[PDB]
C-alpha cells in the first residue's frame, strides 16, 4: 500500500486541523522516502530528527498554490533532502490537473528539495516541470483555509501558518 | 513457540523473548536521562 | 541406519549392493520376510514399508499408527505380521488380505521388543513400562503379563525351533530367560556393564549372543 502522512496545520497559533496527504511511492519512491524521512526522522545532522516538523508555508497564492516546507531558510530558498542535497525528478507521469496534489517545488530541473507545494487548482503549466509527490486524501478544508489566508508582498502570509506536528498515518 | 512472561504476565513468541526481557525493564529514568 | 536408507550387503563385498531409498525419518527396524522376497521396514514416519528383491518397489506403505512404528514382527508362516508402534499400540495386519486383525492394546510406554512365536498362536510384545505382554492369536486376548525387569524391555525373542524359552533383555544390564510358556527366569544373564540393546538366539539353541551398551558382545554357552 502507499504510505500515508499527516500534518497538523497551525495558522496564527490556532490549529485548523490535520491534513492527511498520502504519497505515491509507486510513481515517486524517492519523494515518498524523503517525505517519510522528513516526517519523523532518526538521525539527519549530528543525531537530530531534521525534517518538515516545525516548518511553515512561505508562499500562499489564493486559488493558485500553497508552497512551503522549507526547514533550512524558511522563506522557500532552502534545499534539503535525504540524498544529501538536491535530487532529480522521479517521473513526469503525475500531473497537477487536480486540486489537493502535493508536488515537490523546485527552481528548475533536478533541484527538488524539502519545499512542497499543494496545488489549489488545475495548473497545466506545472505539468512536467515538477513531479507530484502525493495527493491529499483528507483535510482539504485546512488546505483551502491556508490557501485563502491573507498574503502580503511576494505572496508572503501575514499570519504565521506553520505545522505543529507531522508524522506517518 | 510461546512463552509466559516473568515480567508482564502475558504470552509472547519465543523468538522475541530475548528482546522482550531486554526492553521490558528499560528503566524509565534512562529515558528521562 | 538412522538416515532412512536401507543398505543390502553381501557376505563378501564390504560395500552395500543395493541402496533402498524412499524414507526421510529414522529407519527403526528392518526385517526380512521368512519367504525371503519381502522386507518390512518400520521407521518413525508413522508408517511401514514393504520392499522386494525382484521388484525393488514400494509394495505396501501401510500406515495407521498414531506414532512411529518401532518394531515389526512377521509370523512364522508369513500370513500375518504384527507391527508395533511408539504409541503403545500393536496392529496385526494380514499379508494376504491387507487389513488389521488384532489390536495389541494394554501397554503404557512404547513397544520395543515384539516377536511372534514359532508355534503359530502366541505373540510376545515388550514395552518400555517394565512389562511384557504375551497374548494368544487363537484366544484373541492377553494371556499373561511378564514383569521381566525394571527397565525398558528392548529385546524379546524366543527360540526359532520350538520356542520353549523366551529371552527378555532390558536396559537394567541383565537378561532373563523366562520360558516362552514357563515364563521362568531360569537364569539371569548378568555381567553386562551397560544396557542390553539387542539379543538373538541361535538356530540350534546352544548359543545366545546379546549386545550391550558397553560396545561388547557376550555369548551364552552351556557348560
Amino acid at each position: 500500500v502507499n504510505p500515508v502522512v499527516f500534518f497538523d496545520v497551525s495558522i496564527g497559533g490556532q490549529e485548523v486541523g490535520r491534513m492527511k496527504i498520502e504519497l505515491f511511492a509507486d510513481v515517486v519512491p524517492k519523494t515518498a522516502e524523503n517525505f517519510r524521512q522528513f516526517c519523523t526522522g532518526e538521525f539527519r545532522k549530528d543525531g537530530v530528527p531534521i525534517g518538515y516538523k516545525g516548518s511553515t508555508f512561505h508562499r500562499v497564492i489564493k486559488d493558485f498554490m500553497i508552497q512551503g516546507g522549507d526547514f533550512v531558510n524558511g522563506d522557500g530558498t532552502g534545499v534539503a533532502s535525504i540524498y544529501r542535497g538536491p535530487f532529480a525528478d522521479e517521473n513526469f507521469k503525475l500531473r497537477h490537473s487536480a486540486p489537493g496534489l502535493l508536488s515537490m517545488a523546485n527552481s528548475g530541473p533536478s533541484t527538488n528539495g524539502c519545499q512542497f507545494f499543494i496545488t489549489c487548482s488545475k495548473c497545466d503549466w506545472l505539468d512536467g516541470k515538477h513531479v507530484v509527490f502525493g495527493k491529499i486524501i483528507d483535510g482539504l478544508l485546512v488546505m483551502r483555509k491556508i490557501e485563502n489566508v491573507p498574503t502580503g508582498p511576494n505572496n508572503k502570509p501575514k499570519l504565521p501558518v506553520v505545522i505543529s506536528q507531522c508524522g506517518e498515518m | 513457540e510461546y512463552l509466559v512472561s516473568p515480567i508482564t504476565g502475558e504470552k509472547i513468541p519465543a523468538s522475541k523473548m530475548q528482546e522482550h526481557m531486554r526492553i521490558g525493564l528499560l528503566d524509565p529514568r534512562w529515558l528521562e536521562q | 541406519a538412522a538416515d532412512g536408507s536401507v543398505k543390502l550387503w553381501s557376505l563378501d563385498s564390504d560395500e552395500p549392493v543395493a541402496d533402498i531409498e524412499g524414507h526421510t525419518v529414522r529407519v527403526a527396524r528392518v526385517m526380512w520376510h521368512p519367504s525371503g522376497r519381502f522386507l518390512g521396514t518400520t521407521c518413525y514416519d508413522r508408517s511401514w514399508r514393504l520392499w522386494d528383491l525382484e521388484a525393488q518397489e514400494e509394495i505396501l506403505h501401510q500406515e495407521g499408527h498414531s506414532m512411529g512404528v518401532y518394531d515389526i514382527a512377521f509370523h512364522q508362516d508369513g500370513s500375518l505380521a504384527g507391527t508395533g508402534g511408539l504409541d503403545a499400540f500393536g496392529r496385526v495386519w494380514d499379508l494376504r488380505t491387507g487389513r488389521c486383525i488384532m489390536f495389541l492394546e494394554g501397554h503404557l510406554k512404547e513397544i520395543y521388543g515384539i516377536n511372534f512365536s514359532p508355534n503359530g498362536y502366541h505373540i510376545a510384545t515388550g514395552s518400555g513400562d517394565n512389562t511384557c505382554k504375551v497374548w494368544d492369536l487363537r484366544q484373541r486376548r492377553c494371556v499373561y503379563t511378564i514383569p521381566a525387569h525394571q527397565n525398558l524391555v528392548t529385546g524379546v525373542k524366543f527360540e526359532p525351533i520350538h520356542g520353549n524359552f523366551l529371552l527378555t533383555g532390558a536396559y537394567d544390564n541383565t537378561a532373563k530367560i523366562w520360558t516362552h510358556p514357563g515364563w521362568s527366569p531360569l537364569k539371569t544373564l548378568a555381567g553386562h556393564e551397560g544396557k542390553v540393546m539387542g539379543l538373538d538366539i541361535s538356530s540350534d539353541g546352544q548359543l545366545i549372543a546379546t549386545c550391550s551398551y558397553d560396545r561388547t558382545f557376550k555369548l551364552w554357552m552351556a557348560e
Binding site: - | 512463552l3 509466559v4 516473568p6 515480567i7 523473548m17 526481557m21 525493564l25 528503566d27 | 494394554g106 503404557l108 510406554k109 513400562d129 517394565n130 512389562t131 499373561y144 503379563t145 511378564i146 514383569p147 525394571q150 515364563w183 521362568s184 527366569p185
Partner: protein, 224 residues
C-alpha cells in the same frame, strides 16, 4: 514452558518496583494525599529527633517514641500474620495435598521380604502408605512377604528408600514398573499359609505374576 529470569534481571525488576512504589509515595505526599512522613525514632534516635522536647517532658517523649516503635512493630506483625492466614487454609489441604499427579501412570513396586514377623514394621509400612496416599497390598506366607505398592513417582521413591534403607531376612524389589490403571484397593493385610490361596487372591485383580515371581525368586535363592 516457563522461563527463568536471571539474578541480575531479578535485581533490576525488584529495584524498579521499589522505585515505583517510592515515587508513588513521594507524589502522594507532594499533592497532599498522604500526610508527610514523620521521622523514624528509636531509643538511640530519641535524643536527636526529640531532644529539645525530652528535657521538658522526658517521659511523655519516651511514651510517644515507644508508641511509634510499637506501631511500626504492630504493622509488621499484622502484615506477617495477615499473609500467614493464607497457610491457615493453604496448609494440610493445599500445602500438603499434592498426590504427585498420578493420573496417567501408577508406579508399582513389588518387594519380597524374607522375615516380616514384627508388627511394628507392618504398622510403619501402613502409616507410610496412608500418609503418602499410595495404594497396594501385603500378602504373608511361609518366609514370603510380598508387598505391592502402586502410587505416584514421589511416593514410590520414598517407599523404595524407606523399605531398603530405613527398615531392616532381606528386602529386594522384585518388580518396579508402571501400569495403566490401579488394581489394588486400600492398604490392607492378608495372611495366606498356602501359595494357592495367595495366588487366587492375586489373580482377582490381575496381578498373579507377582506371586509367581516371588516364588521363583525364593526357589532360585534356595537352589543356589
Amino acid at each position: 514452558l516457563g522461563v527463568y529470569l536471571t539474578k541480575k534481571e531479578q535485581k533490576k525488576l525488584r529495584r524498579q518496583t521499589r522505585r515505583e512504589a517510592q515515587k508513588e509515595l513521594q507524589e502522594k505526599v507532594r499533592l497532599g494525599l498522604m500526610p508527610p512522613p514523620e521521622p523514624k525514632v528509636r531509643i538511640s534516635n530519641l535524643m536527636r529527633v526529640l531532644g529539645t522536647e525530652a528535657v521538658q517532658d522526658p517521659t511523655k517523649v519516651e511514651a510517644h517514641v515507644r508508641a511509634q516503635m510499637a506501631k511500626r512493630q504492630k504493622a509488621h506483625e499484622e502484615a506477617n500474620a495477615a499473609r500467614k492466614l493464607t497457610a491457615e487454609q493453604r496448609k494440610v489441604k493445599k500445602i500438603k495435598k499434592l498426590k504427585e499427579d498420578i493420573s496417567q501412570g501408577v508406579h508399582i513396586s513389588v518387594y519380597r521380604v524374607r522375615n516380616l514377623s514384627n508388627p511394628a514394621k507392618k504398622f510403619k509400612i501402613e502409616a507410610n502408605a496412608g500418609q503418602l496416599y499410595l495404594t497396594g497390598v501385603v500378602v504373608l506366607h511361609k518366609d514370603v512377604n510380598v508387598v505391592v505398592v502402586e502410587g505416584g513417582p514421589k511416593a514410590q521413591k520414598k517407599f523404595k528408600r524407606l523399605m531398603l534403607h530405613r527398615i531392616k531376612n532381606k528386602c529386594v524389589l522384585v518388580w518396579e514398573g508402571t501400569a495403566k490403571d490401579r488394581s489394588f484397593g486400600e492398604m490392607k493385610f492378608k495372611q495366606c499359609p498356602t501359595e494357592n490361596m495367595a495366588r487366587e487372591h492375586f489373580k482377582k485383580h490381575g496381578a498373579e505374576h507377582y506371586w509367581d515371581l516371588a516364588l521363583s525368586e525364593s526357589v532360585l535363592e534356595s537352589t543356589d
